[PDB]
Amino acid sequence: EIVVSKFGGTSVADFDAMNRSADIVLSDANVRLVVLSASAGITNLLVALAEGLEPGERFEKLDAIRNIQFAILERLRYPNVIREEIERLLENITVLAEAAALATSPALTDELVSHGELMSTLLFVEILRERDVQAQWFDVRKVMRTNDRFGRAEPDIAALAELAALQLLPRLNEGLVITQGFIGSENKGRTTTLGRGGSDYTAALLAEALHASRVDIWTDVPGIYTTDPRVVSAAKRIDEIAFAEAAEMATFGAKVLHPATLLPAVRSDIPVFVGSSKDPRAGGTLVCNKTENPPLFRALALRRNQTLLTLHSLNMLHSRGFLAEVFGILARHNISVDLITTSEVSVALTLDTTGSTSTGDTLLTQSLLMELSALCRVEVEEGLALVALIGNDLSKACGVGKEVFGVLEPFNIRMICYGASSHNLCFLVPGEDAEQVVQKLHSNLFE
Amino acid sequence: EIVVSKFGGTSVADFDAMNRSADIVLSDANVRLVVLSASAGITNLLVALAEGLEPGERFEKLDAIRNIQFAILERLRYPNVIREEIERLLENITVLAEAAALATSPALTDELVSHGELMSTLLFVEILRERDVQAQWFDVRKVMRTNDRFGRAEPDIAALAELAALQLLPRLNEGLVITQGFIGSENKGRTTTLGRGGSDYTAALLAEALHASRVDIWTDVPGIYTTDPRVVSAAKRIDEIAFAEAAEMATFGAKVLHPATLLPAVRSDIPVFVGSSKDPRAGGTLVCNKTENPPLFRALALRRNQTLLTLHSLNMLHSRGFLAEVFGILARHNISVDLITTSEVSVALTLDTTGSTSTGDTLLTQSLLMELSALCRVEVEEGLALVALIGNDLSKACGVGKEVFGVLEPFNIRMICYGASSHNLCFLVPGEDAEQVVQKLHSNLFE
Numbered sequence: 001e002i003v004v005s006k007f008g009g010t011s012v013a014d015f016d017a018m019n020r021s022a023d024i025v026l027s028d029a030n031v032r033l034v035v036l037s038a039s040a041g042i043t044n045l046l047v048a049l050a051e052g053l054e055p056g057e058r059f060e061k062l063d064a065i066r067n068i069q070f071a072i073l074e075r076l077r078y079p080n081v082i083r084e085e086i087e088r089l090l091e092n093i094t095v096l097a098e099a100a101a102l103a104t105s106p107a108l109t110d111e112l113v114s115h116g117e118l119m120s121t122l123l124f125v126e127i128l129r130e131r132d133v134q135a136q137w138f139d140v141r142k143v144m145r146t147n148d149r150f151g152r153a154e155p156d157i158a159a160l161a162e163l164a165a166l167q168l169l170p171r172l173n174e175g176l177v178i179t180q181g182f183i184g185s186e187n188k189g190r191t192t193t194l195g196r197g198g199s200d201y202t203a204a205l206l207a208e209a210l211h212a213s214r215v216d217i218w219t220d221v222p223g224i225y226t227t228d229p230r231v232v233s234a235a236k237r238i239d240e241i242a243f244a245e246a247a248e249m250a251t252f253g254a255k256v257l258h259p260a261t262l263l264p265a266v267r268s269d270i271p272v273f274v275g276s277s278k279d280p281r282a283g284g285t286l287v288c289n290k291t292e293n294p295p296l297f298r299a300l301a302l303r304r305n306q307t308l309l310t311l312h313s314l315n316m317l318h319s320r321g322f323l324a325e326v327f328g329i330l331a332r333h334n335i336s337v338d339l340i341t342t343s344e345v346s347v348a349l350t351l352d353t354t355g356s357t358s359t360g361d362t363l364l365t366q367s368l369l370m371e372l373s374a375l376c377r378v379e380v381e382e383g384l385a386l387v388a389l390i391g392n393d394l395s396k397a398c399g400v401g402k403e404v405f406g407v408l409e410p411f412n413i414r415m416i417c418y419g420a421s422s423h424n425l426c427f428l429v430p431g432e433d434a435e436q437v438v439q440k441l442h443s444n445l446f447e
Numbered sequence: 448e449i450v451v452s453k454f455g456g457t458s459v460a461d462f463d464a465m466n467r468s469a470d471i472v473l474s475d476a477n478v479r480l481v482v483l484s485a486s487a488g489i490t491n492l493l494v495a496l497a498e499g500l501e502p503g504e505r506f507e508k509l510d511a512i513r514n515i516q517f518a519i520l521e522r523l524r525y526p527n528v529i530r531e532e533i534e535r536l537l538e539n540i541t542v543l544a545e546a547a548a549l550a551t552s553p554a555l556t557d558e559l560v561s562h563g564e565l566m567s568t569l570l571f572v573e574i575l576r577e578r579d580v581q582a583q584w585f586d587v588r589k590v591m592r593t594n595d596r597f598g599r600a601e602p603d604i605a606a607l608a609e610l611a612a613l614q615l616l617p618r619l620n621e622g623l624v625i626t627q628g629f630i631g632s633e634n635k636g637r638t639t640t641l642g643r644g645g646s647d648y649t650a651a652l653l654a655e656a657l658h659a660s661r662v663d664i665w666t667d668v669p670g671i672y673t674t675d676p677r678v679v680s681a682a683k684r685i686d687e688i689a690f691a692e693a694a695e696m697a698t699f700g701a702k703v704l705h706p707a708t709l710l711p712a713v714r715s716d717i718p719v720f721v722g723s724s725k726d727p728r729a730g731g732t733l734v735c736n737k738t739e740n741p742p743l744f745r746a747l748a749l750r751r752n753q754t755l756l757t758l759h760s761l762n763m764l765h766s767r768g769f770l771a772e773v774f775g776i777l778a779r780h781n782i783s784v785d786l787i788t789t790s791e792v793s794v795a796l797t798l799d800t801t802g803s804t805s806t807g808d809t810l811l812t813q814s815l816l817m818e819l820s821a822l823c824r825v826e827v828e829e830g831l832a833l834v835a836l837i838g839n840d841l842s843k844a845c846g847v848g849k850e851v852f853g854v855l856e857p858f859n860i861r862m863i864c865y866g867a868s869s870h871n872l873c874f875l876v877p878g879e880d881a882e883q884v885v886q887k888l889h890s891n892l893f894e
C-alpha cells in the first residue's frame with residue numbers, strides 16, 4: 001500500500017514547477033516514493049558534453065547547466081549546504097567533460113549523464129524540507145542493479161527485490177523518500193542508465209519491487225491521448241485504457257511512456273496513472289488490467305527514423321535455415337525487431353532507433369553486415385517512419401483495410417505488417433509525409 | 448537447340464485430344480522431347496486407390512482406370528502389342544491397390560501413382576507411329592534422380608545432368624523421344640513423384656539439363672491470364688511476362704504452373720510458352736527474362752486452404768532466440784513458409800497445403816506442436832485463403848493501399864504481408880469470401 005510518483009523534465013524544470021510537483025506529492029499521503037528525472041534540458045546538455053566538446057562550446061554547456069541549477073538554488077531558504085554539493089557535482093561534471101574531450105565511451109556517458117537526476121533529487125528534498133517535511137534523499141544505485149550494457153542497461157529483477165527490501169523499505173517506513181529514475185549501477189559498481197525516458201521505467205520497477213498499489217506518471221500533458229497532441233491538435237484524451245493496448249502504444253511511438261514501463265505493470269498488476277503536473281484537475285488517464293467495452297480503434301502512434309533492413313538470399317541455404325540462421329545472427333549482435341515481413345526468402349526488417357543514452361550507438365555494425373552480406377544480399381532504407389493503429393480485435397473484424405488506407409491514396413506505403421496481434425496494424429511511409437498521414441487517419445477516425 | 452513440349456491431363460485425356468497434341472508436336476521440328484502427364488482423371492483415381500479402398504469401390508476405380516485406357520486403345524491400328532503391356536500395368540495397379548487396402552505409405556502411393564504417366568506415354572508413342580514417325584518411349588526414371596522424400600521428391604540437378612547426357616541425349620539425336628513428367632527414382636531404385644502438377648516441373652528440368660532453346664506448356668487455357676479464368680470470366684490474357692513476375696504468380700496460386708517450374712527457367716534463361724492444346728491459334732503467353740514496360744499490376748492469384756499458425760511466446764527466451772529458435776524447429780521438421788508477419792514476440796505464419804502426391808500429408812505433427820507449444824503458445828486458424836497481387840515496384844509506388852483495400856470494406860482481412868518484395872502484396876481472407884474478393888479487385892483493376 002504505497003503509491004509511487006514520477007516527475008519528468010518539465011515537472012521539475014525550475015523552482016516553481018518543482019513546487020507544483022511538491023504540492024501534488026502532498027495531496028496524497030500514500031505517496032511514499034518519488035522518482036525524479038533531471039530538470040528539462042539537463043540530460044541533453046550532459047549528453048552533448050559526453051560527446052567530447054572543445055573548450056568553448058564545452059564551457060557554454062557547463063554554464064547552461066550551472067544556470068538551471070542556480071535558478072532553483074537561489075530561491076531556497078538555506079542555500080548554503082546544497083551549494084557545496086552542487087559545486088562538487090558541477091565540478092565533477094566539469095572534469096568528466098574534460099575527459100570526454102579526449103576519450104569517450106558509453107560508460108563515461110552513463111556516468112556523466114547520471115549527474116542530472118542527482119542534482120534534481122537533491123534540490124527537491126530541499127524544496128520539501130523548506131516546508132517542514134520529513135523527506136530524505138536516496139541513491140537508487142544502491143538498489144537498481146543492472147547488467148553492463150551501458151546506454152540502455154537492463155534491470156536485474158531479482159537483485160532489485162532483495163536490495164530494495166534491505167535498504168529502501170526501512171527508509172519508506174521512517175518517512176518520505178526521494179530518489180532518481182533512469183540510472184543504475186552494474187556489478188562492478190560502475191554507473192549505468194536505462195536509456196532515454198528511462199525514468200518512467202524506474203518508477204514502474206520500484207513499484208513492483210516494493211509491492212505498490214499504484215504508480216503516478218506526472219508529465220506535461222493531462223493523460224494519454226489518441227495520438228501525440230503535438231501532431232494532432234484535435235487529439236482526444238483517453239480517460240481509461242488497458243495494459244497491452246497502451247503497452248503497444250508506447251512501443252510504437254507513444255513517447256509519454258517508455259516502451260518498458262508497463263512490463264512491471266503487467267507482471268504485478270500495478271495500475272499506472274498519467275497526468276499533467278501543471279494541471280492536475282484536467283484529469284489524466286489510468287492504465288489498468290482490463291477495460292469496459294474497448295473501442296476498435298484507440299489511437300495512432302508514430303515512430304520516427306525507422307530503418308528498413310530488407311534481406312534477400314544469395315541462395316545458398318534452405319529457407320528453413322536461411323531464416324533460422326538470419327535470426328541467429330541478430331541473436332548474437334542482439335538486434336531486436338518489433339516488425340518483420342517476409343515473401344519466400346526475402347525478409348524485410350523494421351528497425352527502430354536505439355533509444356540509447358549515448359548518441360553514437362549505431363545499430364548496423366560492419367561485422368554484422370559482412371557476416372550477413374555474404375550469407376544473403378542486404379538492403380537498407382532510411383528516413384522512414386512507422387505508423388501504428390492500436391485497438392482491439394482488428395484481425396477478426398471487418399473493414400480494416402479500407403478504413404486505414406482509404407485516406408492514404410496520395411502516399412507511398414512501404415511496408416505493412418499486420419496479423420500477428422489483434423491489437424495493432426503498422427506500416428511505414430517516407431519520413432516527410434509522416435505527420436500528414438497521422439492527421440489524415442486520426443481525422444476520419446476519431447474526430 | 449531443342450524445344451521441350453509438355454502436355455497435361457486434358458491434352459491427352461483421350462484419343463482425339465492425344466491427336467490434337469500429336470499434331471502440335473509435328474508443327475515444329477525442333478520439338479525433340481515431349482513430356483506427358485497421365486490422362487485426365489487417372490492420377491486422382493490412382494491416388495484414391497493408394498489410400499486403401501474396400502473391394503467394391505476399389506473395383507469401380509480400377510474399371511474407371513481401365514475404361515479411359517481402352518477408349519484410346521480401341522482406336523489404334525495395331526492395338527495388340529500395347530494391350531499386353533497395358534494389361535500388365537493394369538494388373539500391377541490392381542495388385543498394388545490390393546496391397547494399399549492393407550498397408551499404405553507415401554512410397555507405395557508414388558509407385559502406384561507413377562503408373563498413370565507410364566500408360567499415357569506408351570499410348571502416345573503408338574499414336575505417333577500410327578503416322579509413320581520415328582518416336583521412341585523413354586523412362587525418365589533412368590534420368591530424373593531425386594531424394595527419398597516421397598510425395599514431393601526434390602530433384603538432384605547434378606545427377607540429372609550426367610544421366611540425361613549419357614542415356615537421353617543419344618536417343619534425342621536418333622529421333623523423337625516421349626517420356627513422363629511428375630515421376631522420378633530415388634537412390635535405392637524406388638519410384639518417386641515430384642508432387643501434384645509436377646509434370647510442368649519435369650519439363651523445365653529436362654530442358655535445363657539438355658540446354659534447350661525453349662519449353663512449351665500445352666494446357667486447357669490459351670496462355671497465362673490476369674487471374675484464374677474459372678474465377679474471373681472477364682479475365683484478360685497476358686501475352687508476355689517475366690520470370691519473377693510469373694514465378695510469384697505460380698507460387699501464390701497460379702495453378703497453370705507448378706511453383707517450381709521456373710526455377711530451372713531462371714537458372715538457364717529458358718523462356719517458357721503457355722497455350723491451349725485445343726486451340727493453338729488463340730495464342731499463348733511467353734515467359735522470359737525481362738519485359739517491355741511492365742505494368743504496376745499484372746494479376747491476382749488465389750491460394751486456397753491456407754493455415755494461419757500464429758505464435759506468441761510463453762516468455763522464456765529473448766526475442767533474438769525466441770525467433771532464431773522458432774525458425775530452427777521448422778528447419779528440422781522442414782516446414783517452409785512463404786509468408787510471415789510479426790509484432791514483437793508474436794509471429795503469424797501463413798501455411799500452404801503440401802501439394803504432395805499423398806493426401807494424408809499432414810503439416811502439423813504433434814511432435815512439432817508439443818515442442819513448440821511449450822517453447823511458445825500456439826494458435827491455428829484454418830479455412831483461410833491467400834490473395835496475392837503481382838506487379839512491379841509496388842513498394843516504391845503510390846496509392847497501393849487504397850487501390851487494393853478500397854473494395855474490400857465488406858470483408859475481414861486477417862493478415863497482410865507486404866514490403867519484402869517489390870513484386871507482390873498478399874493477404875488472407877476467410878475461405879468463403881475468397882472468390883468474391885478476387886472478382887471485386889480484378890474488376891476495378893484490370894477491367
Ligand SMILES: Nc1ncnc2c1ncn2[C@@H]1O[C@H](COP(=O)(O)OP(=O)(O)O)[C@@H](O)[C@H]1O
Pocket residue numbers: 007008009010037197218219220221223224225226227228229230249253254255256257299
Ligand atoms: N499518445 C500520446 N498521448 C499523450 N502524449 C503523447 C502521446 N504520444 C506522444 N506524446 C508526447 O509525449 C510527451 C510527454 O513525454 P516526455 O516529453 O518524455 O515527458 P516526461 O519528462 O514527463 O517523461 C507529450 O508531451 C507528447 O508530446
Ligand SMILES: Nc1ncnc2c1ncn2[C@@H]1O[C@H](COP(=O)(O)OP(=O)(O)O)[C@@H](O)[C@H]1O
Pocket residue numbers: 454455456457484644665666667668670671672673674675676677696700701702703704746
Ligand atoms: N493466372 C492464371 N492464368 C491461366 N490459368 C490459370 C491461372 N490461375 C489459374 N489457372 C488455372 O489453371 C488451369 C490449368 O492447370 P492444370 O489444370 O494443372 O492443367 P495441366 O494438366 O495442363 O497442367 C487453367 O485451366 C485454370 O483453371
Ligand SMILES: N[C@@H](CC(=O)O)C(=O)O
Pocket residue numbers: 008009037038043044116181182195196197198199200
Ligand atoms: N533524464 C533522462 C530520463 C527521463 O527523462 O526519463 C532523459 O532526459 O531522457
Ligand SMILES: N[C@@H](CC(=O)O)C(=O)O
Pocket residue numbers: 455456484485490491563628629642643644645646647
Ligand atoms: N499427373 C500428375 C502431375 C501433373 O499433372 O503435372 C497430376 O495429375 O497431378
Ligand SMILES: [Cl-]
Pocket residue numbers: 009039040041042043044045
Ligand atoms: Cl534534456
Ligand SMILES: [Cl-]
Pocket residue numbers: 456486487488489490491492
Ligand atoms: Cl487426375
Ligand SMILES: [Mg+2]
Pocket residue numbers: 008197198199200255256258
Ligand atoms: Mg519521459
Ligand SMILES: [Mg+2]
Pocket residue numbers: 455644645646647702703705
Ligand atoms: Mg499441371
